[PDB]
């Protein structure tokens, strides 16, 4: 439960991906199978980079769950 009490209606797995957390704290909202859920990673963990052209492509599984591992390694300094 990432949205908490103010999450909305219903509350079940079914064929839809729901709020999922991450090591760095990346809260992934509701979704579904075969859905490319992309988002710019929080590289600004101090104050580095002044462009930021990388992304985090975390697609959901086809059965109805999140993928094994997300490609967050694409994040790098401003060089």
């Amino acid at each position: 439960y990432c949205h908490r009490t103010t999450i909305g209606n219903f509350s079940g797995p079914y064929t839809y991906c729901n709020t999922t957390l991450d090591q760095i704290g990346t809260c992934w909202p509701q979704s579904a199978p075969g859905a490319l859920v992309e988002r710019p990673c929080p590289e600004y963990f101090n104050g580095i980079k002044y462009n930021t052209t990388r992304n985090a492509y975390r697609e959901c599984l086809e059965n109805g769950t999140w993928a094994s591992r997300v490609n967050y390694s694409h994040c790098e300094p401003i060089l």
Binding site: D22, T26, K49, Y72, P77
Partner: peptide, 15 residues
């Protein structure tokens, strides 16, 4: 920055 971005991203591979 020079030595932070690394640890920052180093924590990204864990994701």
């Amino acid at each position: 920055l020079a030595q932070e971005a690394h640890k920052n991203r180093k924590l990204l591979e864990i994701i």
